[PDB]
Amino acid sequence: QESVKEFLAKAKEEFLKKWESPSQNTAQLDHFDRIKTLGTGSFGRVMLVKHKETGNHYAMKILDKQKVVKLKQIEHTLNEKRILQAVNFPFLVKLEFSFKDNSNLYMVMEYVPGGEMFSHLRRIGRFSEPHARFYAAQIVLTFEYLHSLDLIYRDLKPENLLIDQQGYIQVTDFGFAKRVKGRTWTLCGTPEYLAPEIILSKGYNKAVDWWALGVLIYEMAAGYPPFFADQPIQIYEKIVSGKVRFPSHFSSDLKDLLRNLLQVDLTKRFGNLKNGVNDIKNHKWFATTDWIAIYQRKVEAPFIPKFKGPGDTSNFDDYEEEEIRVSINEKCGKEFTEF
Ligand SMILES: N[C@@H]1CO[C@H](CNC(=O)c2ccc(F)cc2)[C@H]1O
């Protein structure tokens, strides 16, 4: 379809111009008031902040340079910021500013007050097939966009899908995203979502994102993931086995799509065949989906999150509030020169 082809050609031109000349140093810490911690991690946290002059709210991701180095995430952190400042798509959280100081790296993103898909899924138990299909269609279009730019995402899971005020998805956390034209080798991702070729230490490609979509659709429609077990070693054994059990309430069309996404042989997996993404878009499970209307945000969403305004944090959870310290001496300057 020439209209999709010309869309993706323009998308790649615009991405490459920003990729080749990344923006740097577009804000500073004392232009923001700190409001609340929204999430934590091994080397960083995300905080709700308010810009002092405009009053706008943002989600500020703060990474400690010394911890990034110790946990061997330097390349990944540079990938994350360089990719985020270059992309533009309706279902991706937008990077608004970035900067660094003696101690930390900062990525200031749009704030999405509806919270994570994960919270809403675990509260209701499972989504109906139409509800799962609405979110799945947005991921299919997002992966078509990213893959056309030679980007692998590598972190699909319900916690990384935020729900906006119109009920649409915004994908966040580009910590494992990478520009890859062929194969890549790093072990990364949450256990339940890993493709077999990652578990087996192979050189793998963008087909791992389509496997992860299969896991996400199964979990949305069942309420639990397909390879669930109590410990990672047992999860990994189930993933590599080539078997799955579907609930009887799944439609036949859903089962068929999932068998083709959760295909252990990556050379036979939907999304990775000669027709690429069109084997997924044209599948019977998606027959009711108007792909253009989803992209244009014209479909009424199945669920509108409840929140009081752009400063409401009620859909995120509570964490111990810790200082943001900035040393008087510069740390790890060489490693993060390009940030
Ligand atoms: N666990 C670590 C700390 O929290 C990170 C993920 N959270 C976001 O990316 C985010 C949250 C809300 C929002 F409005 C925008 C972005 C993760 O790396």
Question: Overview of this structure, please?
Answer:
It is globular, with a radius of gyration of 20 Å. The chain starts with a helix and ends in a 44-residue tail after the last helix. The protein has 2 domains: 4-21 and 116-306, Transferase(Phosphotransferase), domain 1, CATH 1.10.510.10; 22-115 and 307-337, 2-Layer Sandwich (Phosphorylase Kinase, domain 1). It has helices at residues 2-20, 65-70, 74-84, 117-124, 129-148, 196-199, 207-222, 232-241, 252-261, 278-281, 291-295, and strands at residues 32-40, 44-51, 57-64, 95-100, 104-110, 151-152, 161-163, 169-171, 178-179. Strands 1-2-3-5-4 form a 5-stranded antiparallel sheet. The chain is of the alpha+beta class. Helices cover 33% and strands 14% of the residues. The chain has 11 helices and 9 strands. Bound molecules: the ligand N[C@@H]1CO[C@H](CNC(=O)c2ccc(F)cc2)[C@H]1O. The ligand N[C@@H]1CO[C@H](CNC(=O)c2ccc(F)cc2)[C@H]1O is lined by residues 38-41, 44-46, 59, 93, 109, 111-112, 162, 172-173, 175. The PDB classes it as transferase. The entry lists the keywords serine-threonine kinase, small molecules, ligand binding, fragment-based drug discovery, transferase. It forms a monomeric assembly.
